[PDB]
């Protein structure tokens, strides 16, 4: 239940993604878990909210992450790749321009099991999750939910 970044594993074991625990709620990308229940030690985490179009899902409560990229500053991907210690990768986001507004995007290409890794602003707040994007080289949207 501790705040932090977590690996999402499946059973040998394989890492299928990453997520964020904050305020007693686990946040990851829908495509990582497809909404399946998660085990945490002897406990079970059930899905609470999910949306395929946003590609997001929360467990144990509503989505809590609400910070947003300021459009000017560098950010850090807190990447948790399979088999590797959590590590911070700093970058200046580009932009996804859409009919419904602009979304920050990071031109960083890490293994698929890194999906769900948080992207952070300078104050350490999670401004979105890594792992839904396009190819041009892969570019990930900074995907943030609604609180």
């Amino acid at each position: 239940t501790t705040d932090g970044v977590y690996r999402v594993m499946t059973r040998g074991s394989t890492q299928v993604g990453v997520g964020v625990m904050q305020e007693g709620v686990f946040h990851t990308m829908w495509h990582v878990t497809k909404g399946a229940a998660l085990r945490s030690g002897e406990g079970r985490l059930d899905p609470y909210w999910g949306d395929v179009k946003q590609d997001l899902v929360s467990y144990c409560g509503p989505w809590k992450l609400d910070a947003a990229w300021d459009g000017l500053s560098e950010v850090q991907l807190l990447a948790v790749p399979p088999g590797e210690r959590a590590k911070n990768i700093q970058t200046l986001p580009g932009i996804f321009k859409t009919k419904d507004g602009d979304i920050g995007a990071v031109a960083l290409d890490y293994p698929a099991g890194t999906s769900g890794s948080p992207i952070l602003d300078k104050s350490g707040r999670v401004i979105g999750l890594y792992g839904n994007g396009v190819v041009i080289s892969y570019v990930s949207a900074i995907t943030q939910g609604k609180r």
Binding site: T2, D3, G4, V5, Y6, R7, V8, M9, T10, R11, V16, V18, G19, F26, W30, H31, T33, A36, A37, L38, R39, S40, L45, V52, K53, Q54, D55, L78, V80, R85, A86, N88, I89, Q90, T91, L92, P93, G94, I95, F96, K97, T98, D100, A105, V106, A107, L108, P118, L120, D121, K122, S123, G124, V126, N132, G133, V134, I136, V139, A141
Partner: protein, 40 residues
């Protein structure tokens, strides 16, 4: 299929992080399935 979670770290900014990656500006569309695609 047993899907489970393991803590991997605190959520913190790191002063000595490596810096990399460019900052492309892309026109994209988001469809009902959550899939981004390029638009021209």
């Amino acid at each position: 299929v047993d899907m489970y979670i393991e803590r991997a770290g605190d959520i913190t900014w790191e002063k000595d992080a490596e810096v990399t990656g460019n900052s492309p500006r892309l026109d994209v569309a988001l469809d009902e399935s959550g899939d981004f695609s390029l638009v021209e």
